[PDB]
Amino acid sequence: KLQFALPHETLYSEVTQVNLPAKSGRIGVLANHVPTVEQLLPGVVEVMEGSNSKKFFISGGFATVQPDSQLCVTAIEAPLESFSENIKNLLAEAKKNVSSSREAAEAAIQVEVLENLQSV
Amino acid sequence: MPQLVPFYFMNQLTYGFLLMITLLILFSQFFLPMILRLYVSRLFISKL
Amino acid sequence: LTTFSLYTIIVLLVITSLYTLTNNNNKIIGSRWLISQEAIYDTIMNMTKGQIGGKNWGLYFPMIFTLFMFIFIANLISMIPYSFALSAHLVFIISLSIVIWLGNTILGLYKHGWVFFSLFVPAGTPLPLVPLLVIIETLSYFARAISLGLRLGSNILAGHLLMVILAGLTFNFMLINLFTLVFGFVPLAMILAIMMLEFAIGIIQGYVWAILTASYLKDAVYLH
Amino acid sequence: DESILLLTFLGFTGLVAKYLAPAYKDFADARMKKVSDVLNASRNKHVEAVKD
Amino acid sequence: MQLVLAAKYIGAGISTIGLLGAGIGIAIVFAALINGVSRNPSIKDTVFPMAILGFALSEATGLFCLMVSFLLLFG
Amino acid sequence: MQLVLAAKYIGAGISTIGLLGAGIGIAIVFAALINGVSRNPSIKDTVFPMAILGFALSEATGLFCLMVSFLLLFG
Amino acid sequence: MQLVLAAKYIGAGISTIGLLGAGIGIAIVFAALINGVSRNPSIKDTVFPMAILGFALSEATGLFCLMVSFLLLFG
Amino acid sequence: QLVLAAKYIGAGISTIGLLGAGIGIAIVFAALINGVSRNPSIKDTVFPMAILGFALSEATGLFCLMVSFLLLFG
Amino acid sequence: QLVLAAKYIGAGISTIGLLGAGIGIAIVFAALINGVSRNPSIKDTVFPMAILGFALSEATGLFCLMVSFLLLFG
Amino acid sequence: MQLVLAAKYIGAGISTIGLLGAGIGIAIVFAALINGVSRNPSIKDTVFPMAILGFALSEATGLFCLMVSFLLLFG
Amino acid sequence: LQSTLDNIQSARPFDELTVDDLTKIKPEIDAKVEEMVKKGKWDVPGYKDRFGNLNVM
Amino acid sequence: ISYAAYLNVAAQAIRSTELQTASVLNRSQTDAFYTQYKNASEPTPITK
Amino acid sequence: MLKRFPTPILKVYWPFFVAGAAVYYGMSKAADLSSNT
């Protein structure tokens, strides 16, 4: 089915449709989708197991449909709601940080996260 | 649909440009702000 | 009498009823027919707020709205099978395109001086092709003059003419060997598909006009 | 010739009334509902404030 | 006169050639649709109206060829 | 006249060229189907209606072409 | 005289071939649109103006071609 | 005479139509090989699809061919 | 006269060149859409470059058209 | 004389056909430029002058053809 | 305030309403409409938020 | 930068409205040092 | 609802209107030139 797993938690260890943002744009996986390995970009993820749909904000990871149709999703952390106003404030400060500064790359990643936040 | 070459171009065009100026004034001053009134009225109830 | 003049009168009376007797109750919930012209209003409001992007975005929203509605109504009325085409007088539609092109050129000259032609200087490039990139920008600037009108003219003219030639052919197809008039519904259905398509390309053109002459106004209001 | 064209227009209005007129009804209905619920909600909302 | 009437019939055939481009065009839109829908699944709600628009525009260019064909063929 | 009758037979041939475009077009839709369905075998049930639509529309451009051919041939 | 009118109508037919290019061109732009949306469904609103711009410009070359056809046909 | 000459020339023109159909058949098959290599196992669903795709691609050529025969043979 | 006929015919043949520009333009705009969908952010640099590529593609067809007007009118 | 003069003009029209390939060619270079720049975000400083060379060369084929068209047309 | 609670209950046109009555009770309406046309920015925010934006594109 | 460092930074940013439990915060905030060694000689414990 | 809200079209839409007037005159002459035949 689907393994959706975090180090200290598991979100959804027969899932029908999953919509994922990956290094391949956005990919949707529906029942049998031929087996892939794609690194998951930091993401806003929707998982539908049956018609029921769960909305996640996910810190990226790696995605792998297995040949046995075990959709191994591994990601570091997440719900959408948990990520969600103060975060918007903090990111403005972080945006300021990009002006100065690995720390340079880090602040750039923070801007990428700001884009990811903007998606919400 | 079947058409020839008019010579009545200016006759036609006179009525054509008249319709444009009429509709422009009519929309702009009357009927478009009546839509903007609907939006704004709805928003004023929404605020109040 | 002038056939063109009579159908312009019909267009005007339709439009007056469309914004008077469309929600004559003046509901804050809005009458069902007027919901259409609200959604249209918003998708062109937010489109010409994006494109024009100036303070005059909403100042040129009535003009772009009557450029939508003109083409939208005149590509419904001209589609009626016993109605006289305003569009068959191409000279009004093409004339309107040249008028707007000139009113863009004057607007551009007014807004950006005699350095309006710096719009047709696009970027630094090696020196032997700096003038070249002015020539094949200015050519496109008055290719912009005629392209906009002739697009709309070609779709509408071709649709009505196509339908009429095929209708006459299927009429005489039915007159010959009467057993083909029996089950002569399939060519009627081919004409039906074309008539559906002619409504589609007529509604597509009213919006396409209004986005393309929004792009031309984007250039005219702010240089580049 | 042109009566074939008039038959085509009749077919066009027939297709519209089956498919589009209920769909457009549903579209209109949907919007009307959404507006109405917002409207009555705001009215309710301020009644709460009076009590507060 | 035989020349002019013959010219009508020849000219019709030449005009017919223009249609080929629209024919390939329709397919290009639908091929893209099928591949794209396979990637996303559910993108289709947005994308399917775009596909119809694309078809109509490609087809329209085709219709211009057809009306010239009929102008020469029939009159 | 020999010239007019000839013109019909030449002109018919010219019309026939256009149909080639549709041939390529149909194949293009099918190519996408195979690749698409390979990428996601379960998308097929949604996609197969779309595919048949794309075939039909591409084919229609071909029909108009073939009609013009038959008009010269059997007119 | 017959030659002049024949040549006029022939010349019209020949020009009509030019239209095919724009018909394919439009389709290519829509294929790109479909791919763009599927790879990033939020790109669409920015892309929608760019797509229409490319459609118009592609179409324009065909419409110029069509003017040569109309100059001959109507004129 | 001119009518008979015209038949033979006209027929030749029609033959050009065939080229597109030929290209079409190849395109379906190219996709077949790509698809097959991609899944290893799409094959059983795809095999009737492939035959259909072949048939239609060929078919546009066949219509051209029937017109050619009509002009050539009579 | 034959010369009068010849200029009308020649004008027809020259007009076909516009075809190349119509395809060309679409390839530039397609690549623009692909680049922008790939990056979300390349567009500021790319949009000017794309307009250059467009102008040049269109120009080739316009040379064909200019030849057409020189024949047709001239 | 008349036949020769006709043949100059006709030959010129025919010559104008060759130009289309160079036009499409220029677009192919520019597509690769956009695409390349999207791959690196940063190749562009080398690649932009490289691209102007590619443009000039693809364009050049068109100019050779155009020269001949003018030699036929004016000459 | 007691009177006000009663007043919201006894005065509330919760169904359909004429925009003229709203203009009459709030000339704030007409002021804003005139100012929006005068500004030439006909954007209404909150009509895209707490009402649908009714866009097609 | 390394892929897992990239994801790490993203995860840390992602634990920001804040609502988060201490354990989340701990997986995204730890203090430590890395004392490199040599083939012997140790580049000093520098905060990781 | 139906109320006049002034728009200063003589400085908003002035270049459009100038182009319209010029073309109005020009189409009179074009019509006159075409009415010879």
Domain boundary assignment for chain F = 2-75
Tokens of C178: 């009467």
* I25 close to G25: Cβ distance less than 8 angstroms: yes
CA-based nearest residue to B45, from F60, I62, C27: C27
**What is the C-alpha separation between A24 and A62, in angstroms, rounded?**
12
Note whether A54 and A102 are same-domain residues: no
Could you list the residue range(s) of the whole structural domain that residue B11 is in?
A: 1-48
CA-based nearest residue to I30, from G47, G29, G37: G29
**What is the C-alpha separation between M28 and C95, in angstroms, rounded?**
12
Q: How many CA atoms lie within 13 A of C81 on its CB side?
A: 21
The DSSP 8-state label assigned to residue D16 in this structure reads I
Cα dihedral A101→A105→A110→A115 (10° resolution): 120
**Cα-based distances in Å from G63 to C144, E30, J16:** 12, 25, 18
Contacts B–D by Cβ distance under 8 A: 8
Say yes or no: A119 contacts chain G, CB-CB below 8 A: yes
**What is the C-alpha separation between C177 and M23, in angstroms, rounded?**
54
CA-based nearest residue to F28, from M10, A107, H27, B26: H27
Phi, psi angle pair for A39, to nearest 5°: -75, 125
* E8 close to E75: Cβ distance less than 8 angstroms: yes
Note whether A78 and A23 are same-domain residues: yes
* L10 close to A60: Cβ distance less than 8 angstroms: yes
Cβ contact G25–I20 (<8 Å): no
Could you list the residue range(s) of the whole structural domain that residue A112 is in?
A: 87-119
Beta bridge partners of A65: A71
* C67 close to B20: Cβ distance less than 8 angstroms: no
DSSP string, chain C: --HHHHHHHHHHHHHHHTTTTTSTT--SS--TTHHHHHHHHHHHHHHHHHHT-STTTTTTHHHHHHHHHHHHHTTTGGGSTTS--STTSHHHHHHHHHHHHHHHHHHHHHHHGGGGGGGG--S---GGGTTHHHHHHHHHHTTHHHHHHHHHHHHHHHHHHHHHHHHHHHHHHHHSSTTTTTT-HHHHHHHHHHHHHHHHHHHHHHHHHHHHHHHHHHHHHS--
3-state secondary structure chain H: CHHHHHHHHHHHHHHCCHHHHHHHHHHHHHHHHHHHHHCCCCHHHHHHHHHHHHHHHHHHHHHHHHHHHHHHCC
- CA K15 distance to own-chain centroid: 14
DSSP string, L1-48: --HHHHHHHHHHHHT------HHHHHHT----EE-----------EE-
Say yes or no: G66 contacts chain I, CB-CB below 8 A: no
Residues of E in contact with G6 (CB under 8 A): 3-4, 6-7
Say yes or no: I42 contacts chain J, CB-CB below 8 A: yes
Tokens of J18: 């060759």
Residues of A in contact with F40 (CB under 8 A): 29-30, 32-34
CA-based nearest residue to C163, from D2, E19, D13: D2
Burial class (CB in 10 A: 0-12, 13-18, 19+), A14: exposed
Find tokens 């909403």 and name the residue.
C58
Which one-letter amino acid corresponds to residue G14? I
Say yes or no: B43 contacts chain D, CB-CB below 8 A: no
What is the C-alpha radius of gyration for chain I, rounded to an integer number of angstroms?
Answer: 18
**Cα-based distances in Å from F62 to A100, C131, C170, F2, F67:** 63, 46, 19, 30, 9
**Cα-based distances in Å from I64 to C129, H44, H71, I69, J14:** 20, 51, 36, 9, 11
Cβ count within 10 A of residue C141: 18
Residues of M in contact with K20 (CB under 8 A): 1
Say yes or no: B1 contacts chain D, CB-CB below 8 A: no
Cβ count within 10 A of residue I17: 32
**Cα-based distances in Å from L28 to A108, I8, L25:** 18, 78, 5
- Give the CATH architecture of domain G2-75: Up-down Bundle (1.20)
Cβ contact K5–D47 (<8 Å): yes
Indicate the residue of I51, I58, I59 with minimum beta-carbon distance to C122.
I51
Experimental method reported for this structure: cryo-EM
CA-based nearest residue to B19, from J4, C133, C89, D47: C89
What CATH number labels H1-74? Answer: 1.20.20.10
Run of H or E residues at A74: strand A71-75
Cβ count within 10 A of residue J56: 14
**What is the C-alpha separation between C81 and M28, in angstroms, rounded?**
32
Cβ contact C26–M1 (<8 Å): yes
3 state SS of A43: strand
How many domains is chain B partitioned into structurally?
1
3 state SS of A4: strand
* C214 close to C51: Cβ distance less than 8 angstroms: yes
3 state SS of A61: strand
Phi, psi angle pair for A27, to nearest 5°: -130, 145
**What is the C-alpha separation between A111 and A93, in angstroms, rounded?**
11
* Strands L46-47, L33-34: pairing kind: antiparallel
**What is the C-alpha separation between B29 and M5, in angstroms, rounded?**
5
Contacts of M8 (CB under 8 A, 6+ apart): none
Tokens of A12: 């959804």
**What is the C-alpha separation between I14 and J17, in angstroms, rounded?**
6
Cβ contact M31–B7 (<8 Å): yes
- CA F43 distance to own-chain centroid: 26
User: What number of residues does chain K have?
Assistant: 57
Note whether A93 and A73 are same-domain residues: no
Note whether A3 and A53 are same-domain residues: yes
What is the C-alpha radius of gyration for chain K, rounded to an integer number of angstroms?
Answer: 16
Contacts C–G by Cβ distance under 8 A: 26
Q: Which fold has domain L1-48?
A: Atp Synthase Epsilon Chain; Chain: I; (1.10.1620)
3 state SS of G29: helix
- Taking each helix axis as running N to C, give the angle between helix M14-34 and helix B9-25, from 0 to 180 degrees, rounded to the nearest 10: 160
Cβ contact E56–C197 (<8 Å): yes
**What is the C-alpha separation between C119 and C101, in angstroms, rounded?**
15
Find tokens 């025969």 and name the residue.
H69
3 state SS of A46: strand
**What is the C-alpha separation between J30 and J52, in angstroms, rounded?**
9
Run of H or E residues at A39: strand A37-40
**What is the C-alpha separation between F22 and F30, in angstroms, rounded?**
13
